[PDB]
Amino acid sequence: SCRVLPGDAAWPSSRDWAKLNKTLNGHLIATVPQASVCHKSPFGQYDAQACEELKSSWDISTITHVNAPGDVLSQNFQNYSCVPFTDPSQPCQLGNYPSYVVNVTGAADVQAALKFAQKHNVRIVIKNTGHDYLGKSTGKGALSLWMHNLKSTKFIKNYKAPYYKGPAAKLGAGVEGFEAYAMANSTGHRIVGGTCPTVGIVGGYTQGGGHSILSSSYGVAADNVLEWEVVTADGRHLVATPTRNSDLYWALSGGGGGTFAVVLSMTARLHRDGIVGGTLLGFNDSAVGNEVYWEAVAAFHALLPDFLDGGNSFTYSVGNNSLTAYGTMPGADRDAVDRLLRPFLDDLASRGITPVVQPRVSTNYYDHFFTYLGPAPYGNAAYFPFTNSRIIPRSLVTDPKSNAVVTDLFRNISQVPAFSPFYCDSFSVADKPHPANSLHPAWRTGMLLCAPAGSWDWDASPEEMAARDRYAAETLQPMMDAATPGGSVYLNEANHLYANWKESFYGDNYARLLRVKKKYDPDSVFYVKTGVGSEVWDVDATGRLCRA
Ligand SMILES: *Cc1cc2c(nc3c(=O)[nH]c(=O)nc-3n2C[C@H](O)[C@H](O)[C@H](O)COP(=O)(O)OP(=O)(O)OC[C@H]2O[C@@H](n3cnc4c(N)ncnc43)[C@H](O)[C@@H]2O)c(*)c1C
Ligand SMILES: *[C@@H]1O[C@H](CO)[C@@H](O[C@@H]2O[C@H](CO)[C@@H](O[C@@H]3O[C@H](CO)[C@@H](O)[C@H](O)[C@@H]3O)[C@H](O)[C@H]2NC(C)=O)[C@H](O)[C@H]1NC(C)=O
Ligand SMILES: *[C@@H]1O[C@H](CO)[C@@H](O[C@@H]2O[C@H](CO)[C@@H](O)[C@H](O)[C@H]2NC(C)=O)[C@H](O)[C@H]1NC(C)=O
Ligand SMILES: *[C@@H]1O[C@H](CO)[C@@H](O[C@@H]2O[C@H](CO)[C@@H](O)[C@H](O)[C@H]2NC(C)=O)[C@H](O)[C@H]1NC(C)=O
Ligand SMILES: *[C@@H]1O[C@H](CO)[C@@H](O)[C@H](O)[C@H]1NC(C)=O
Ligand SMILES: *[C@@H]1O[C@H](CO)[C@@H](O)[C@H](O)[C@H]1NC(C)=O
Ligand SMILES: *[C@@H]1O[C@H](CO)[C@@H](O)[C@H](O)[C@H]1NC(C)=O
């Protein structure tokens, strides 16, 4: 009826766990949260010096945190169970963290863990980096398939398929953005990946869609997938391609992580590298007042279409008084950058704004990326646990009427100090060749992906963070939704309590996604919150998974 929890009569004995540990060649880990050094029981590992080092970067996406077996990055899902900022005498508890972690070395480890979990009625969790904003990579009382260490990279000079011919990279499931970029750069190529360097490229990133500053040139991450190597729920080690287990390939390419199969690697398109044009472009209200500022943002938005259609992108911060943008202009030299920027600069000029404009040309993509989103290799990307999103259709922006509503939404969010400023990315991803995939159609009509993100506050109460959580899901996200009809919520950047997840994340694709889910996982061994087919499991008050 329900998944077993620590404390249950039916929880596996330590002998059961040892027997799994043997099968796994010693690769079972009992979860000990990284902040156990900040507490006294039950791990008896208290260390004030090490506790203090954890504090200064805890709210950053760091390699240190990503390297922990059972930790996730979300302060909200940590949920004060074993964190560096509570009383030392407060017991270091697992809470939402999995009980045991399978340190996966290949297909056999997964097959073993799946057999064990199915024999013993244990919840499977899948964790790669722990970046998930929706907690989809933790679970109380769970055995976790920890994919972080599957780091193999393989350059394929001449991938040969009817629908793709050219360079490709086969990447293990734990390969992170910075690893993918180092690997692609060394061969004279670019790969489509996230702006946050520590993000797992093969994980929930590509599986859930995956936007990039390179998307205007090469589509979303999932568009660039050639092959998925997987283990299915019943333990079959398979390869999914457009011409083999194609329905699984379709679901995995934009249908979301952690529900269809356990991914061991992906093979993806590489693209020839070269000169990359870049800029800082910033403007504020200090000379024109706030009203002209918001009209200038409205106009900046309206001016994107031709810039994006030329293969370029803007990633930018929208504040209450200033906008700061970083431009990505692949293959553009300095004269080309200038011509590309001239419409935006003329618009600001006509509105009495003196922008901050800092154009450059990088030799390669890697250099461009880490100039703007560094430092290399890990970056410095803050973790905001109340991340929401809207994919905003081009047609909304290009009509002044509907664009006014878009602008008015951004003004409203700018008044909410925990959610301001916020980042947007801009892209054109229609009419590029890619295989059939399950990527939400709003991506094709979309021009903006904006992520209003609420920071965590270690001085605030738990009740205040819980209130911020409910605010994001039931007030801020629906306000965003209503202001942008025909758009959608990016499944990777949403709140776990957001009520309209099914329609907004998946849309009309959902029936077919559900058919694929029932084909490859008929017993629903894979569960993630807001995942395809997740409505099979209820989460009770204590956090136990029970069959709906
Ligand atoms: C934390 C963070 C996230 C970001 C950042 N920047 C992004 C950007 O510029 N563009 C984007 O499109 N997305 C950005 N994201 C979000 C990530 O795209 C999502 O948060 C992804 O879900 C991240 O995936 P991953 O790195 O794998 O993190 P996990 O929490 O480990 O997994 C998420 C999800 O996927 C399942 N899963 C992962 N790996 C597997 C394998 N191998 N097999 C099966 N299932 C897998 C997990 O179960 C979970 O459900 C910038 C920042 C700072
Ligand atoms: C942080 O930890 C607390 C536990 O201290 C979690 O609170 C629990 O949250 C769930 C869902 O919000 C509550 O379940 C609800 O129970 C009622 C019956 O009482 C049921 O009718 C509802 O449908 C729902 O399932 C639960 O009561 C609550 N428990 C307590 C003690 O507050 C919280 O979810 C954790 N936060 C995160 C982000 O993990
Ligand atoms: C599962 O098996 C391995 C057996 O080696 C355990 O890993 C060892 O853990 C001890 C601590 O007790 C360390 O001192 C060693 O470094 C590890 N062994 C080796 C050979 O390196 C692991 O702890 C076991 N886990 C569980 C949950 O039973
Ligand atoms: C998870 O498993 C991997 C592979 O068994 C471990 O990687 C080894 O770690 C040691 C350092 O402790 C290195 O000297 C070896 O070169 C690594 N082996 C391989 C094949 O990469 C990894 O340390 C384990 N991690 C945890 C947290 O248990
Ligand atoms: C990227 O690759 C080139 C050769 O392809 C190499 O010379 C250069 O050092 C690399 N850059 C970085 C920053 O690793
Ligand atoms: C606003 O823009 C002006 C002119 O570009 C610049 O000098 C100034 O530093 C900016 N102010 C803020 C607060 O960003
Ligand atoms: C902005 O705020 C007003 C007043 O609170 C509200 O009525 C309106 O719906 C909001 N506008 C948008 C575009 O969401």
Author numbering: 27 to 574
Excerpt from the publication:
In the present study we report the discovery and the structural characterization of two novel flavoprotein oxidases from the thermophilic fungus M. thermophila. VAO-type proteins are composed of a FAD-binding domain and substrate domain. In both MtVAO615 and MtVAO713 the cofactor FAD is covalently tethered to the protein by covalent linkages.
The crystal structure of MtVAO615 with amino acid residues 27–574 was solved in two different space groups. The structure at pH 7.5 contains one monomer while the structure at pH 5.0 contains two monomers. Rcryst/Rfree are 19.5/23.5 and 23.6/28.0 respectively. As already observed by SDS-PAGE, MtVAO615 is heavily glycosylated, showing electron density in 2Fo-Fc maps for N-glycosylation at Asn47, Asn105, Asn129, Asn211, Asn310 and Asn438. As expected, MtVAO615 harbors a bicovalently linked 6-S-cysteinyl-8α-N1-histidyl FAD while MtVAO713 has a monocovalently linked 8α-methyl-N1-histidyl FAD. The isoalloxazine ring of the cofactor is covalently linked with the C6 atom to the Sγ of Cys222 and with the 8α-methyl group to the Nδ1 of His157 in MtVAO615 and His159 in MtVAO713. The groove shaped substrate binding pocket of MtVAO615 is solvent accessible and contains, besides His157 and Cys222 which tether the FAD, Tyr159, Thr221, His237, Thr341, Tyr352, Leu399, cis-Pro401, Ala402, cis-Pro403, Ala408, Phe410, Thr413, Tyr449, Asp451, Leu475 Ala477, Ala479, Glu519. On the other hand, despite having a bicovalently bound FAD cofactor, access to the active site of MtVAO615 is rather narrow. In particular, Phe410 and Tyr449 seem to create a sort of funnel. No other suitable reference dyes could be obtained. These observations indicate that the redox potential of MtVAO615 is extremely high for a flavoprotein, around 120–160 mV, which is close to the values reported for other bicovalent flavoproteins.
